Design a protein around this ligand. Structure first.
Ligand code: FAD
Ligand code: CL
Length: 488
């Protein structure tokens, strides 16, 4: 008989899940498994993202329960847990969604050889990206494109991505009863308290496929907005209603299928002939994700500067004091500190807000390596993506893809063009809530009487600016021009 395991890592969803569909076909018993390391906090991960993952597992649990099955959260590492459960459960087939991350390749290749020795057939469909990214490289002559323009012409010749897979059946083959490793007390979904976190999450975005599909339908309530979407024209200061979809956490964990998103976009585009085109369109935003996945999965050392063949070797400063002030939202520039506060509280910021804080730390003002900034983003972002975080950090620091280092965002003027009254700043920096709008982006320029009346005295309640942007940005541009000349 056929007993199968569907192994969730990403792809935390029931819709468009070809690995789940294959596991369930002709199966007597199906074991939906997520493997959790109970000592992940011993040597990195904010409670905001880890609880987002836990909320995604609880949503999967309710979906399987509604279909007569159950999600098993196994504690341990995959190389030690799977050899046991293969024999105990009589497994004949192991299915999981393909993954191209570095550790994913080492981990999955080990699980492949263990299944082989146990007589278990392995099926690994592709469904986390729009396309088989290896097929895109092979169609391009054996190398990934290095520009978005060249990449978009490639996918146009390749054609549309595969349609989303059908829904799973209304009833699922359940796990066998009275299996010791499937005991409910040892396979439940933990809380953030039980895994060791002492501070509760503060983010307003809840995990799960249900929330992902709810947010998708909300975005498509106005097809005119979807059709005319232009990414560079969206408001980074909008927080009551963010200016973009905020689907990145759900796409990162696979709570939302990228192919379903793409299919829904095509349905709208065919009724709106004047819809926006790549790279600025909403479809173009998914192509950015596909582009960085295609380049990153084929480039060694993609997340580092050293050994990375696509990253410029820049002599970045080792300044812990600048990094600490940037990391702790005490730079003295309210626009920067407000966004860095949104990072630690929400775990998500608008794309152009990420631009501001990334440019400031690296090629704009402080000249600290983008790897240090990525380390800070990798801890707090609920949508942290190994390939996307790295690519955009190299972009913003002009180390890869982007080269126009004379374009420098002002930590004073940038946000003022969107939010002259500083509503975003008052929301995330309540110490400046009473400051008149004339000085909220430059609180040090406010006369002392105004600072006292507003209850925010620069130097006691809110720090002075750690740098002069005029001086600091001039020093950073001159240094980048010399680094660009020595790297020929
Ligand atoms: C320094 C820096 C680091 C970043 N780190 C990440 C990261 O770790 N994870 C992440 O998902 N995005 C990252 N991005 C990209 C971008 O900031 C987010 O994807 C976007 O803000 C998410 O909001 P949204 O879901 O509303 O995007 P939308 O505009 O609604 O776009 C929809 C989807 O397209 C994809 N997408 C959009 N913009 C980009 C982009 N620039 N690159 C790649 N894919 C994109 C995402 O999957 C996103 O969910 C980073 C940007 C910067 C400048
Ligand atoms: Cl600017």
């Amino acid at each position: 008989v056929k007993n199968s395991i569907i192994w969730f890592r990403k792809g935390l969803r029931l819709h468009d899940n070809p690995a789940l569909l294959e596991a369930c076909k002709d199966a007597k018993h199906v074991y939906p498994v997520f493997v959790l390391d109970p000592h992940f906090l011993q040597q990195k991960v904010s409670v905001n993202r880890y609880n987002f993952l836990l909320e995604s597992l609880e949503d999967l649990q309710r979906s399987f329960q509604a279909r007569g099955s159950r999600l098993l959260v196994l504690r341990g590492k995959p190389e030690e847990v799977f050899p046991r459960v293969f024999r105990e459960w009589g497994v004949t087939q192991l299915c999981f969604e393909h993954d191209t991350e570095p550790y994913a390749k080492v981990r999955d290749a080990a699980v492949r050889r263990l299944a082989a020795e146990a007589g278990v057939e392995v099926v690994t469909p592709i469904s986390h990206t729009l396309y088989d990214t290896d097929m895109l490289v092979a169609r391009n002559g054996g190398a990934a494109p290095l520009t978005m323009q060249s990449f978009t012409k490639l996918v146009d010749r390749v054609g549309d991505p595969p349609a989303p897979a059908p829904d799973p059946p209304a009833a699922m083959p359940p796990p066998a009863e009275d299996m010791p490793s499937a005991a409910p007390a040892a396979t439940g979904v933990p809380t953030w308290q039980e895994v060791g976190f002492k501070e509760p999450p503060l983010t307003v975005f809840k995990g799960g496929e249900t929330e992902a599909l709810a947010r998708l339908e909300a975005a498509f309530q106005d097809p005119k907005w979807v059709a005319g979407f232009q990414k560079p024209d969206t408001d980074p200061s909008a927080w009551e209603k963010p200016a973009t979809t905020v689907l990145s956490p759900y796409l990162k964990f696979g709570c939302l299928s990228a192919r379903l998103f793409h299919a829904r976009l095509l349905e709208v585009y065919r009724r709106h002939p004047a819809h926006s085109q790549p790279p600025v369109s909403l479809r173009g935003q998914l192509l950015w994700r596909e582009f960085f996945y295609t380049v990153g999965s084929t480039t060694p050392n993609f997340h580092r500067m050293a050994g990375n063949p696509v990253c410029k070797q820049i002599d970045w400063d080792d300044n812990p004091e600048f990094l600490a002030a940037w990391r702790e939202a005490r730079t003295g520039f309210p626009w920067i500190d407000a966004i860095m506060t949104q990072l630690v509280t929400w775990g998500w910021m608008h794309h152009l807000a990420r631009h501001s804080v990334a440019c400031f730390l690296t090629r704009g003002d402080l000249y600290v390596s983008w790897e240090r900034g990525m380390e800070v983003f990798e801890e707090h972002l609920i949508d942290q993506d190994h390939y996307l975080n790295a690519a955009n950090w190299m972009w913003l620091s002009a180390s890869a893809f982007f080269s126009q280092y004379f374009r420098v965002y002002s930590p004073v003027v940038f946000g003022k063009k969107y939010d002259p009254e500083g509503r975003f700043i008052r929301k995330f920096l309540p110490v400046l809530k009473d400051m008149p709008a004339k000085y909220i982006y430059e609180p040090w320029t406010a006369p002392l009487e105004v600072q006292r009346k507003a209850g925010c005295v620069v130097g006691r309640d809110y720090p002075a600016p750690i740098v002069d942007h005029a001086v600091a940005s001039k020093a950073c541009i001159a240094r980048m021009a010399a680094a660009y000349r020595r790297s020929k």
